[PDB]
Structure 1
Amino acid sequence: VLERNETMYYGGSLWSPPSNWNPFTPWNAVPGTTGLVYETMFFYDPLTGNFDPWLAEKGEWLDSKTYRVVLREGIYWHDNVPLTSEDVRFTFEIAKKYKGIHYSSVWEWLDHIETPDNRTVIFVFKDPRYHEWNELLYTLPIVPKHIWEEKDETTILQSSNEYPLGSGPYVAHSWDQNKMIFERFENWWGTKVMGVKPAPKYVVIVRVLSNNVALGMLMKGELDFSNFMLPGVPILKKVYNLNTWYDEPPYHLSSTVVGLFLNARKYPLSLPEFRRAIAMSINADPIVQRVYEGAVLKADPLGFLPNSVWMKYYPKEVVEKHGFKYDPEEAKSILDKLGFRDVNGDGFRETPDGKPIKLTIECPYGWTDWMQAIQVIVDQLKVVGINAEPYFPDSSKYYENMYKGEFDIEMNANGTGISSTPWTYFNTIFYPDALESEFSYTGNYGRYQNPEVESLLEELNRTPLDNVEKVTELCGKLGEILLKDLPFIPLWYGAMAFITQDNVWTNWPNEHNPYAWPCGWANWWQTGALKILFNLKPAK
């Protein structure tokens, strides 16, 4: 039983029973495990693009192939063991020893690590992949050598890591099927050194069956910090005093690229020209206008987030010449040309060989906005003679399907989140290593194959970010492939849905006090939601 006034209720990113706290398995780890319990070398702030020293006191390129971080002094694990450069060293090297660890690939371009003292980590690279390194700096959680030292690979990969031993502001406290509770670690080093202190003694991650349940909670004042997508925002504000980031439409910040992955290995979705017909048959205007009531922004064909630093590298002419539009008559014309015609007379087009075509289109149950969006896509596909069947599995099955590539059509925003480089977006789309993976956690979920994308991805990755002309050119070349082969169809920019109320906690960020990115998704707490905790004030 938790004291209400000492407790902040968060919801929006827990859609399965909390059952994993393993920093090595971020796809299964309960939201907050990284960020609240395990710490990263840097914070990252999507509002500004700034990296802010967390564990790292500083991080610099000494030269084009050498990166050095100097840790802050006085960092400790929760069990009072000093956190040192060897902890950081270990974090990387355990993956060279055990290649099954998802980030073992870094050693294909990381040559070795030096630690001239216990605060200093020096990375020397065989092949410096800058864009990817930048992201590692704020996404790779640092783990305790003295805890994991003598575990084998199966233990590391398969353990649940209950009551994870970290260095961060919180510990795991308790949980059940419907919530995860974090309790503030009072002797946190972060407070002694950085002078910050997360205001709630307890953070509860609330799991809910569907978005509609969360709204009732908010109206009852039982959620404080909500990332659920909820309708009727003007009314929520006026009638129920629930607040959003912006006072006016679109009300929410934009955080992701929402679109459709297609199974590139299942006929007829294996056909580029069929994928194109699908893209041209979909009109997002009623999704944007009616499902979201103007609370999201519609995507252009390339799908670069308008509020992101990717725009700095926008390949404008490529999009103009190769982008698609909603054009259902041309979609039908393409389908006729390919031989996809109705031969039994039920209004659906068959294969040229005369065989029926039925494609499932799926999203998680309870994501009410995507379920509605999926049905308008279904109705829009029906009208060009394409039989799409909506399917809303449990979130856990939705993600298993995604990783395994066991889907026909799939609504997706997994890895397309805002970032410091358009490389994340293209990697999520094209991720070549998916073709030789049972489980693809990184992207390319529909197993799209292309002989030139891997080289393009790498060339982009090793191009210094300040080389605008070259990064732009490479985004152009990659965008050109995306636009012509459409393995992923961008539709709109997902809202960073963020609704709060002030009955228990106040001083939330918004457009008038825009101090932190409000995202409590797994792996996102170090992008701002932790900083919000630092800044919250109890209500009077």
Structure 2
Amino acid sequence: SLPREDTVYIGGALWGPATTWNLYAPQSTWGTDQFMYLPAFQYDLGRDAWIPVIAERYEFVDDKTLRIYIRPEARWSDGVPITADDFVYALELTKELGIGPGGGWDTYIEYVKAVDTKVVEFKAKEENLNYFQFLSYSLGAQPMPKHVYERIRAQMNIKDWINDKPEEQVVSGPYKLYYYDPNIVVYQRVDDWWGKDIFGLPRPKYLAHVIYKDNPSASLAFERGDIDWNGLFIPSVWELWEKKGLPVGTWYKKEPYFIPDGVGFVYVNNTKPGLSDPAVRKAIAYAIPYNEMLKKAYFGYGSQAHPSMVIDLFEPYKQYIDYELAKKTFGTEDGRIPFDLDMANKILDEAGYKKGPDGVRVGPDGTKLGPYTISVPYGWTDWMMMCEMIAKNLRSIGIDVKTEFPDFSVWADRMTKGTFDLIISWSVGPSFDHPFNIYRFVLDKRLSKPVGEVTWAGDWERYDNDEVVELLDKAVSTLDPEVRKQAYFRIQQIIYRDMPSIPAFYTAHWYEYSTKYWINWPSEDNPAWFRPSPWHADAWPTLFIISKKSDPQPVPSWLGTVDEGGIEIPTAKIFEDLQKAT
């Protein structure tokens, strides 16, 4: 019985059943990290700047010692001040449990310390100095309510906690859980949210996500007015407003329709026999029908990824790509991997793989290129079609691969515990520290977990390489772009030699909106926020920008850099202060 005009309905973000609202549980429900728990600083990709959220400012004591000053007003939804202890607690608990927000912080942060009630101090580990990770883990730190979690641990194992009682939920964001069941999850605004004076209140009173079983059923809901804020794959999206005259839109009104989200991989499990062979993984890369699948299945909503894992859609990242290495390795104009079944077969043949009587390859060690599955969640129709196309080409070269589409939760379980064979999945996207962020996420064994244990922090494929570790530990030991560049170049050599997993395409930042009840959605025309997809980790400002149709509100005054009248701090200003602290 939600008030329609005060409720935003979402699609494409919650798939499968709600799980928990505990960022320390094996899985959590859409909306938890996004809306319930905010960071010290929120990175703004669109402006390359940082919103001071829970924190109001930083100070470098020296270039390796950063203090973060918590806003006095910053307060949990139960009224308990957010304090430096909350920041310490969150990170220490993640280290203890092997899971949780800020995973891997202890690798690059020496300590996090509460030097006063509203002052946290982060110190960079010197032995493997990395300024990017130092800044990422500190500025982006998410506190967690120590007074809440401690009570929980005295009562039960933290990992088993569901956090599903609305009246008990304690959050730092402007929303918390209102109600849920097998068919829906609903969030309600916290009207006396601590950030009310500084940021204003977000305009929707409720966020509601009906749980749709698949793309077509969600698409129907969208076409009939039942979804305001969508993060869906939609075939021929333009026809919604052209042909059908519906009041809906996307970021772009013409071709690509969507801004890029990141890099979609064909992930290949390194621990499986056959798939453990780099030659087999290389052959898989040549058997992906990149252009045909991206045009047919993906509607040109995204294009083929560069094998360097660098997102070359953005000109500033191109410098981090060794183009002559990539061109020399793959023999194409830009160094992308070409679809070529002849080469995939040749790679297999020269690695000693020979088709048995049933067509399926057997290695020189007797390893059969197996019954394997390629898996994506049920209902994700574009990825399913791509899986069918990839699997067919693999079967033709003697790699026995069939598709399998379990519920999201099952799919996520096998992905994170590393029991899959092949999957399509995401990685990371554009960022201040990008190409490093993707190498850290995809290639770093330190972020992985043993087979059978959940990891959301990275390296689902369980790639194991000590040299990459050394390279990342050196990559940003100084701010000199040249040092970073050279480390990226050696990593790219390693990627081509090992093919740990295949960077296939640039994922679309699925984002559609209806203007039936809500207006001023971000778009190319209204570029107020550059991560507006409802499922994105950084979607929350979107809710502060939109207005009810019956009562338009202006775009928030805090958006924009300090020099433009806003409160956001350019990444350039931060590195300037770092440099000045030497």
TM-score with structure 1 setting the length: 0.92
Do structure 1's residue 405 and structure 2's residue 418 form an aligned pair? yes
What's the secondary structure of 2:354's corresponding residue?
coil
2:326 maps to which of 319, 323, 337: 319
> Partners in 1 of 2:247 and 2:107 — Cα distance?
53
Q: Which residue of structure 2 lines up, in the alignment, with residue 420 of structure 1?
A: 432
> Partners in 2 of 1:131 and 1:500 — Cα distance?
34
Q: 1:95 to 1:361 in 2, by over 3 A?
A: closer
> Partners in 2 of 1:492 and 1:259 — Cα distance?
7
Q: 1:197 to 1:223 in 2, by over 3 A?
A: same
Q: Which residue of structure 2 lines up, in the alignment, with residue 182 of structure 1?
A: 187
Do structure 1's residue 234 and structure 2's residue 238 form an aligned pair? yes
User: Deviation digits for residues 177-233 of structure 1, max 9, x if unmatched?
Assistant: 1221111111111112x1422110111133211111111011110000000111112
Q: How does 1:267-278 map to 2 (within 5 A)?
A: 267-278=273-284
Letter in 1 for 2:546: L
Q: Which residue of structure 1 lines up, in the alignment, with residue 576 of structure 2?
A: none
Q: Which residue of structure 1 lines up, in the alignment, with residue 153 of structure 2?
A: 152
How far is 1:150 from its partner?
4.6
Q: How does 1:65-104 map to 2 (within 5 A)?
A: 65-95=64-94, 98-102=96-100, 103=102
Do structure 1's residue 48 and structure 2's residue 47 form an aligned pair? yes
> Partners in 2 of 1:85 and 1:267 — Cα distance?
47
Q: Which residue of structure 1 lines up, in the alignment, with residue 565 of structure 2?
A: none
Residues 41 and 50, structure 2, Cα contact 8 Å, conserved in 1: yes
How far is 1:104 from its partner?
6.8
Q: How does 1:350-389 map to 2 (within 5 A)?
A: 350-352=362-364, 353=366, 355=368, 357-389=370-402
User: Deviation digits for residues 283-328 of structure 1, max 9, x if unmatched?
Assistant: 2101111112211122122232234564453333332233443222
Q: Which residue of structure 2 lines up, in the alignment, with residue 491 of structure 1?
A: 504
Letter in 1 for 2:21: W
Q: Which residue of structure 2 lines up, in the alignment, with residue 28 of structure 1?
A: 27
Q: Which residue of structure 2 lines up, in the alignment, with residue 456 of structure 1?
A: 471
Q: Which residue of structure 1 lines up, in the alignment, with residue 202 of structure 2?
A: 198
Do structure 1's residue 224 and structure 2's residue 223 form an aligned pair? no
Letter in 2 for 1:318: L
> Partners in 1 of 2:136 and 2:210 — Cα distance?
28
What's the secondary structure of 2:507's corresponding residue?
strand
What's the secondary structure of 2:484's corresponding residue?
helix
What's the secondary structure of 2:338's corresponding residue?
coil
Residues 134 and 420, structure 1, Cα contact 8 Å, conserved in 2: no
Residues 529 and 542, structure 2, Cα contact 8 Å, conserved in 1: yes
Q: Which residue of structure 2 lines up, in the alignment, with residue 301 of structure 1?
A: 307
User: Deviation digits for residues 362-387 of structure 1, max 9, x if unmatched?
Assistant: 11111100000011112222333332
User: Deviation digits for residues 68-124 of structure 1, max 9, x if unmatched?
Assistant: 11122212211112222332233334456x354445753354333444443222222
> Partners in 2 of 1:287 and 1:138 — Cα distance?
39
> Partners in 2 of 1:12 and 1:131 — Cα distance?
32
How far is 1:264 from its partner?
1.6
Q: Which residue of structure 1 lines up, in the alignment, with residue 17 of structure 2?
A: 17
Do structure 1's residue 282 and structure 2's residue 281 form an aligned pair? no
Q: 1:31 to 1:118 in 2, by over 3 A?
A: same
Do structure 1's residue 215 and structure 2's residue 219 form an aligned pair? yes
How far is 1:539 from its partner?
1.5
How far is 1:479 from its partner?
1.6
State how many pairs are aligned: 530
Q: Which residue of structure 1 lines up, in the alignment, with residue 541 of structure 2?
A: 531
Which structure 1 residue ranges, 5 or more long, are not aligned? none
Letter in 2 for 1:142: P
Higher mean displacement: 498-507 or 478-487: 478-487
Q: Which residue of structure 2 lines up, in the alignment, with residue 244 of structure 1?
A: 250
Q: 1:263 to 1:105 in 2, by over 3 A?
A: closer
How far is 1:7 from its partner?
0.3
What's the secondary structure of 1:297's corresponding residue?
coil
What's the secondary structure of 2:86's corresponding residue?
helix
> Partners in 2 of 1:101 and 1:443 — Cα distance?
11
CA RMSD, 1 decimal: 2.3
Letter in 2 for 1:19: T
Q: Which residue of structure 2 lines up, in the alignment, with residue 131 of structure 1?
A: 132
> Partners in 1 of 2:98 and 2:278 — Cα distance?
33
1:263 maps to which of 269, 287, 292: 269
Residues 310 and 320, structure 2, Cα contact 8 Å, conserved in 1: no
Q: 1:497 to 1:108 in 2, by over 3 A?
A: closer
How far is 1:332 from its partner?
1.4
Q: 1:394 to 1:341 in 2, by over 3 A?
A: same
Letter in 2 for 1:319: A
Q: 1:34 to 1:342 in 2, by over 3 A?
A: closer
Residues 311 and 317, structure 2, Cα contact 8 Å, conserved in 1: yes
**Aligned-residue identity in percent:** 29
Residues 18 and 180, structure 1, Cα contact 8 Å, conserved in 2: yes
What's the secondary structure of 1:204's corresponding residue?
strand
> Partners in 2 of 1:478 and 1:356 — Cα distance?
27
Higher mean displacement: 150-159 or 9-18: 150-159
How far is 1:253 from its partner?
0.4
TM-score with structure 2 setting the length: 0.85
Q: Which residue of structure 1 lines up, in the alignment, with residue 355 of structure 2?
A: 342
Residues 269 and 421, structure 2, Cα contact 8 Å, conserved in 1: yes
Q: Which residue of structure 1 lines up, in the alignment, with residue 570 of structure 2?
A: none
1:473 maps to which of 479, 486, 494: 486
> Partners in 2 of 1:84 and 1:269 — Cα distance?
47
Q: Which residue of structure 2 lines up, in the alignment, with residue 37 of structure 1?
A: 36
> Partners in 2 of 1:447 and 1:106 — Cα distance?
19
What's the secondary structure of 1:152's corresponding residue?
helix
Q: 1:385 to 1:174 in 2, by over 3 A?
A: same
Q: 1:382 to 1:115 in 2, by over 3 A?
A: closer
> Partners in 1 of 2:94 and 2:350 — Cα distance?
51
Q: Which residue of structure 1 lines up, in the alignment, with residue 554 of structure 2?
A: none
User: Deviation digits for residues 406-448 of structure 1, max 9, x if unmatched?
Assistant: 12211111x3233332222112221213364633322222222
2:341 maps to which of 328, 338, 362: 328
> Partners in 1 of 2:143 and 2:520 — Cα distance?
30
> Partners in 2 of 1:176 and 1:101 — Cα distance?
26
